[PDB]
Design an enzyme around this catalytic site. Structure first.
Site, mmCIF file in Angstrom:
data_model
loop_
_atom_site.group_PDB
_atom_site.id
_atom_site.type_symbol
_atom_site.label_atom_id
_atom_site.label_comp_id
_atom_site.label_asym_id
_atom_site.label_seq_id
_atom_site.Cartn_x
_atom_site.Cartn_y
_atom_site.Cartn_z
ATOM 1 N N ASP A 1 0.833 -1.230 0.000
ATOM 2 C CA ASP A 1 0.000 0.000 0.000
ATOM 3 C C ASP A 1 0.853 1.260 0.000
ATOM 4 O OD1 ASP A 1 -0.521 -1.934 2.527
ATOM 5 O OD2 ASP A 1 -2.290 -1.956 1.223
ATOM 6 N N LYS B 1 -7.483 11.160 12.346
ATOM 7 C CA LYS B 1 -7.162 10.481 11.093
ATOM 8 C C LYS B 1 -8.159 10.833 9.997
ATOM 9 C CE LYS B 1 -9.628 6.307 12.418
ATOM 10 N NZ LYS B 1 -9.644 4.822 12.411
ATOM 11 N N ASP C 1 -4.378 1.931 -5.397
ATOM 12 C CA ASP C 1 -3.015 2.276 -5.010
ATOM 13 C C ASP C 1 -2.311 1.121 -4.309
ATOM 14 O OD1 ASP C 1 -4.114 2.369 -2.376
ATOM 15 O OD2 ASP C 1 -4.590 4.489 -2.676
#
Lengths: 968, 317
Positions: free
Chosen positions: A665, A734, A894
């Site tokens: 990732d 986050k 991604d």
DNA sequence: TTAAAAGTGCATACCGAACAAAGATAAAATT
DNA sequence: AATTTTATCTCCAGGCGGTATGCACTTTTAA
């Protein structure tokens, strides 16, 4: 220019051409030309279609008459008008004087006969007939800088091969072709293993008798509707008779029965039953047209010859990309108003024709419709809903049918996908698939894809082809456990939804509704997985309007939840070799998520530390320590631990062959591109874009800066800070920072901070409004200090988009690869509606280029769309350069997957392509393109906003190669 | 916005219609948005137990000082009737106070629906949220929660002209006859107690003390006392959602017959149902009396031998 | 024979409401 | 200029339905 009636008449003429109802089209054209007002609707295209339809029959006098009407109307005949007359004679075998006259007449237009072939997109048979008549009288390679290395023949190429023999591949292709021709797939149901009873037998018998009555009733309704629409045709009126004559009666009956059984017990909107019935009709139409036209045989032979490229034993004279080999080997819709009207007619015919007894309990004297039309109210608005009879729903659940039914597109392919040689052709063999997923009437994406130079799109197309060629298979041992959980009890904490029968009053009912939806998705995905447990299958891919790539089968792919990615694994295999097991253990630790902040060495050591738990979980996934459920992703971790245990229990780990994928990732990929474009120095080090011994987390850095600000304010004796004591963490902040690439503002972030604070019991509720206002500005100042180039780029992009929308045009840009992208945001001002007996459908004309651009949504989507386009470009570059080295490569937008033994190799190019992707002046080229496109015609402000590009920071990009945690 | 009386004579004229209408002393008044308090002065010289409910904290000190200086019964609780009992959130901001706590500190308790009236609520309706407030009150009344949880309470409020006409619309006036009229007229015996021209009041905006149209728009003081036998064996607070859906559906196509709407709403025989209520098959919706709607709903709900009666499974939202 | 009531086609406005909100703020809309 | 108003987080396939109103024309019907 395209009015509501004009499109419908044009589609009627083309449909009559397709089904050869030339007398009807001729009569209707005569009627429209008779009346003065009704004549103005007709245009040259309608006349050309009508005469072309007659040309295939060879009736020359009809062509003379239509040409006479065209001349009378004042319209000047064009090249296709003469082409139809030319091709009529070839079948008619007329005298050369007519050909000479027709050829001479073109001297008025001046374009030559070969110009007729080039300008007019005539069919191959039409081209041949025109050539025969006129005889009586008279691959490139992309040269882009970024893709030069991929398409250069000179060099070393190691394109991989499948693991299957040619004979098996051809047998699988035959099976897939048969399944797609049948257009339905029957799948056994994972739920309800068995139910032997008298009541289920009675329910099955009643259902079968009802289905017979419904099919006969729908046949009669079809016949009556066809007769009605025909008699409306003979009255000089538009109708939909040809669109009902396209398919067989029995095919449409099977269609409607399948759609009826697919209706959920909670109903569905009319505009949805209308859209899906029209789409299914079009798919069956194109499949049947290709079947009867004979292109099935041409495709069969070409595919049987093309499969030698990917086969193991077979070989080719020169290895090439599948698109290039397909090209070298020999290469073999309705307007939205019509689609909507056709769906309503079928939906109404379905609701009216079907009938059932009111009381199925015992032996009702009256019959009632199966479907009811009700209204659902949302604030001031209302929605039409088609809800089944509750007795019918009870009958469905009592029957417990053992078999589901899937559309052809829904099930994954059993044979390799077709190469994406063009936007028109690709993916599925027969069924149509558009390259860019969008709304039905949307034709501004495909228009730009088709009008681009043919070489430019290649880099995209080839990439998709590779993503489709990757084989797959179902993990048996994981699937057995998931089936065991799903059937008996469920485990909502793990991810397997609980059965509806077991206990989950209004709150209870809302919980029940969400649980029923989840259980239905699970029966569809586990049924597909059970069906494909012993078969290798492929998944085609297609782009969205920006450039990201998604699989075509929605119900079962690798872009799903934990179970979806847990079941899938590569069908092929590669030996682990020297570094395979290290990467397997690192992947296991990454899935657990416990050691996110640690370096790779520490994760590898920790994997050895807890090896006993891994062995026990692999051996006894449900009767041991059950450590695997503690991970962030339990099922993926279980699969990885099973693979690692099998690898370490073998005689030689380096000789062990592993099918399990491994993910690498990115770290905050959107920020990773902001930093690269802006050459940000402090930001790049935060996003792991600069070499370091320990991974750098942006989330914890933002939390630390916020905590420092909190302590500084508490030193000032302010109550808002004094309330906070250790509450600031990456968990709290986050969500706010991950959406900064999406353009979130202070208002939006405050809601998420409030949501995060709400679970926190320690925090006093009274300070929530004040704290959220505090944390918002603290976080925003932290990001402003860390990411300044990011903010400058976002501001410049948003301002340019706003000015473009104010100028009256949508925002479009070219990706660095060469793919052009246009934004689909326009204002629904004029209402469009169709009058029907049951209800008047309100629809949006998706393909309206007259609508005004929607400035809010245009300027609020430009930066994230640009970042997703760049992300897709990077993914495509790495996919191609990995394929050049025999790499299996599949990516979730991604998250690059690869074989365990290959991971390092992927990294070596994954960074390198990035380094070159941003090496080109992306921002300066974007500015030049936008100036050339939207400013070559108030323009001063637009020109100044686009001419001022933010100045690049001080940074050397080449160090991304040595970065260890750029992608991990 | 909001408006309060600025004339002594208008407050005096309101005093007797507000207080002397109930000949029984012990009725306390839960006045809403006192403003300056001149109307509260009139009700206090009338001698009633005026419980002021000020929306904000700005004018509480003045009223509290006036009440305490003479030991008058003027308890200025910081609450607003508009935001009373909000479903959203768990922590209640003091301006939006939960009904249970307000009644507990007020001192009033619950009474049976068949019993007499506990108290009376007075004031003026919101300037631009009349529909919203009416819908909230109807939902609370039919659900038997919030203010009406303790008992039937009069709501003596000034309402605008257009909203009043839409509320009092009848099948004889089908232009404005809508679902609000039916739901209110089945529950409350609405009767206009007073009518006044809005130029009398003074509008006190956010800063302080369209507009002309509002002033010319006559306000009607309307009294809503819930009917004693509104809730029955078949019409219950649990089943009120189905009835609300039936009424909102039947007015989706106002220019339509009830017999076709029954097919869309129930699987039962439309003609058989219409026969029970003694109505012809060819009956428009706008010609149905508000009591006829309730009779229809109760007739449908009383199907003796069947298993399914409705198509509102809450899936519709 | 000639004029018309009836009808078909399009746009176009206007109506119909549950369920707090506490500040900031900046562009767009309104004045 | 200047007060109000209203949105406030990207994509992966999406939209209220009814009634009345006027217009501009063809069309069935009046004498």
């Amino acid at each position: 220019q395209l009015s509501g009636q004009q499109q419908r008449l044009l589609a009627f003429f083309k449909c009559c051409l397709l089904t050869d109802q030339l007398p009807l089209a001729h009569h209707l054209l005569v009627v429209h030309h008779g009346q003065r007002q009704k004549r103005k609707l007709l245009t040259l295209d309608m006349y050309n279609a009508v005469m072309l339809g007659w040309a295939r029959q060879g009736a020359f006098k009809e062509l003379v008459y239509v040409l006479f009407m065209v001349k009378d109307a004042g319209l000047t005949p064009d090249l296709l008008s003469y082409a139809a007359a030319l091709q009529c004679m070839g079948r008619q075998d007329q005298d050369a004087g007519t050909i000479e006259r027709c050829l001479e007449q073109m001297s008025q237009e001046g374009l030559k006969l070969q110009a007729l072939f080039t300008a007019v997109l005539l069919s191959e048979e039409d081209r041949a007939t025109v050539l025969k008549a006129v005889h009586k009288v008279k691959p490139p390679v992309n040269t882009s800088k970024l893709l030069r290395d991929v398409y250069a023949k000179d060099g070393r190429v190691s394109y991989p091969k499948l693991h299957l023999p040619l004979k098996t591949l051809q047998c699988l292709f035959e099976k897939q072709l048969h399944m797609e021709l049948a257009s339905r797939v029957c799948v056994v149901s994972v739920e309800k293993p068995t139910l032997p009873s008298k009541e289920v037998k009675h329910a099955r018998k009643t259902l079968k008798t009802l289905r017979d009555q419904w099919e006969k009733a729908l046949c009669r309704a079809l016949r009556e509707t066809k007769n009605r629409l025909e008699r409306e045709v003979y009255e000089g009126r538009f109708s939909l008779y040809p669109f009902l004559c396209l398919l067989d009666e029995r095919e449409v009956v099977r269609m409607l029965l399948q759609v009826l059984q697919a209706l959920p017990a909670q109903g569905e909107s009319f505009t949805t039953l209308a859209r899906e019935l029209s789409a299914r009709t079009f798919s069956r139409h194109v499949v049947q047209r290709q079947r009867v036209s004979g292109q099935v045989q041409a495709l069969q032979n070409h595919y049987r010859k093309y499969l030698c490229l990917l086969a193991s034993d077979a070989e080719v004279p020169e290895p090439c990309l599948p698109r290039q080999y397909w090209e070298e080997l020999g290469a073999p819709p309705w307007p939205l108003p019509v689609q909507m009207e056709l769906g309503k007619l079928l939906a109404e015919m379905l609701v009216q024709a079907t009938q059932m007894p009111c009381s199925l309990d015992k032996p009702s004297s009256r019959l009632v419709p199966v479907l009811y039309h009700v209204y659902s109210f949302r604030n001031v608005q209302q929605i039409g809903i088609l809800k089944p009879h509750p007795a019918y729903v009870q009958l469905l659940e009592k029957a417990a049918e053992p078999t589901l039914t899937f559309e052809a597109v829904d099930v994954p392919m059993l044979c390799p996908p077709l190469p994406w040689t063009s936007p028109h052709s690709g993916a599925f063999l027969l069924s149509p698939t558009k390259l860019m997923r969008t709304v039905e009437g949307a034709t501004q994406h495909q228009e730009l894809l088709e009008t681009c130079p043919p070489t430019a799109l290649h880099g995209a197309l080839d990439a998709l082809t590779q993503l489709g060629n990757c084989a797959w298979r179902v993990n048996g041992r994981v699937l057995d456990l998931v089936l065991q959980l799903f059937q008996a009890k469920g485990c909502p904490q793990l991810g397997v939804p609980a059965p509806p029968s077991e206990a989950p009053l209004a709150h209870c009912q809302k919980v029940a509704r969400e649980m029923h939806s989840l259980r239905a998705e699970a029966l569809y995905r586990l049924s597909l997985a059970q069906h494909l447990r012993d078969r290798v299958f492929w998944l085609p891919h297609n782009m969205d309007f920006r450039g990201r790539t998604y699989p075509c089968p929605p119900h079962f792919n690798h872009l799903g939840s934990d179970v979806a990615r847990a079941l899938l694994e590569f069908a092929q295999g590669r030996p682990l070799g020297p570094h395979g097991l290290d990467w397997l253990k690192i992947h296991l630790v990454n899935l657990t998520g416990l050691k996110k902040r640690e370096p790779l060495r520490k994760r590898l050591a920790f994997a050895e530390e807890v090896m006993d738990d891994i062995l026990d979980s692999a051996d006894q996934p449900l009767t041991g320590r059950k450590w695997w459920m503690g991970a962030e992703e339990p099922w993926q971790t279980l699969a990885c631990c099973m693979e690692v245990a099998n690898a370490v229990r073998a005689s030689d780990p380096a000789a062990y062959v592993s099918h399990l994928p491994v993910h690498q990732d990115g770290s905050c990929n959107g920020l990773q591109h902001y930093a690269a474009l802006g050459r940000d120095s402090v930001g790049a080090a935060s996003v792991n874009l600069e070499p370091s011994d320990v991974p750098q987390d942006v989330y914890s850095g933002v939390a630390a800066q916020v905590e420092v600000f909190r302590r500084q304010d508490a030193q000032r004796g302010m109550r808002v800070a004094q309330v906070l004591e250790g509450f600031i963490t990456r968990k709290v902040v986050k969500q706010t920072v991950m959406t900064v690439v999406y353009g979130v503002t202070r208002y939006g972030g405050r809601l998420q901070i409030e949501k995060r604070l709400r679970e926190l019991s320690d925090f006093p509720q009274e300070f929530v409004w004040e704290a959220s206002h505090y944390l918002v500005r603290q976080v925003f100042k932290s990001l402003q200090e860390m990411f300044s180039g990011t903010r400058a780029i976002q501001h410049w992009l948003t301002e340019s988009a706003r000015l473009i929308s104010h100028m009256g045009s949508v925002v479009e840009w070219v990706t660095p690869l060469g793919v052009p992208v246009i934004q689909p945001y326009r204002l629904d001002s004029k209402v469009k509606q169709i009058g029907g007996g049951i209800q008047s459908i309100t629809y949006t004309h998706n393909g309206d280029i007259s609508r005004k651009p929607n400035t809010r949504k245009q300027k609020n989507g430009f930066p994230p769309n640009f970042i997703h386009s760049l992300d897709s470009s990077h993914m495509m570059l790495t996919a191609l350069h990995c394929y050049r080295k025999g790499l299996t490569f599949v990516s979730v937008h991604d998250c690059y997957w690869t074989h365990a033994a290959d991971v390092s190799v992927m990294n070596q190019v994954c960074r390198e392509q990035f380094v070159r992707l941003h090496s080109e002046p992306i921002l300066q080229d974007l500015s030049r393109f936008l100036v050339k496109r939207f400013c070559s015609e108030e323009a001063s402000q637009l020109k100044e906003t686009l001419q001022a590009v933010p100045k690049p920071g001080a940074f050397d990009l080449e160090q991304v190669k040595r970065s260890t945690y750029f992608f991990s | 916005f909001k408006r309060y009386v600025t004339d002594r004579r208008l407050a005096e004229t309101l005093a007797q219609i507000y207080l002397g209408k109930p000949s029984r002393p012990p009725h306390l008044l839960l006045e809403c948005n006192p403003g300056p308090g001149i109307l509260t002065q009139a009700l206090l010289e009338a001698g009633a137990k005026v419980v002021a409910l000020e929306s904000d904290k700005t004018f509480i000190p003045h009223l509290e000082s006036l009440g305490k200086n003479l030991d008058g019964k003027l308890r200025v609780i910081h609450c607003d009737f508009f935001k009373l009992d909000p479903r959203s959130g768990g922590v209640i901001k003091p301006p939006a106070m939960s009904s249970r706590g307000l009644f507990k500190n007020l001192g009033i308790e619950a009474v049976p629906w068949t019993a007499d009236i506990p108290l009376k609520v007075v004031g003026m309706f919101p300037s631009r949220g009349e529909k919203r407030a009416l819908w909230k009150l109807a939902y609370d009344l039919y659900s038997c929660t919030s203010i009406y949880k303790f008992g039937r309470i009069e709501v003596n409020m000034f309402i605008g002209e257009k909203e009043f006409q839409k509320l009092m619309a009848d099948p004889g006036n089908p232009d404005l006859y809508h679902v609000l009229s039916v739901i209110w007229q089945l529950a409350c015996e609405i009767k206009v107690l007073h009518m006044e021209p809005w130029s009398s009041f003074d509008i006190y905006t956010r800063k302080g003390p369209e507009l002309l149209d509002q002033l010319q728009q006559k306000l009607y003081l309307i009294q809503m006392i819930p009917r004693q036998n509104l809730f029955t064996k078949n019409l219950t607070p649990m089943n009120y959602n189905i009835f609300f859906h039936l009424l909102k559906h039947c007015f989706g196509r106002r220019s339509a017959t009830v017999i076709d709407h029954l097919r869309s709403l129930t699987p039962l025989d439309a003609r058989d149902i219409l026969m029970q209520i003694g109505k012809q098959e060819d009956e428009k919706v706008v010609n149905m009396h508000p009591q006829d709607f309730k009779t229809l709903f109760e007739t449908i709900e009383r199907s003796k031998d069947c298993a399914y009666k409705w198509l509102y499974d809450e899936t519709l939202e």
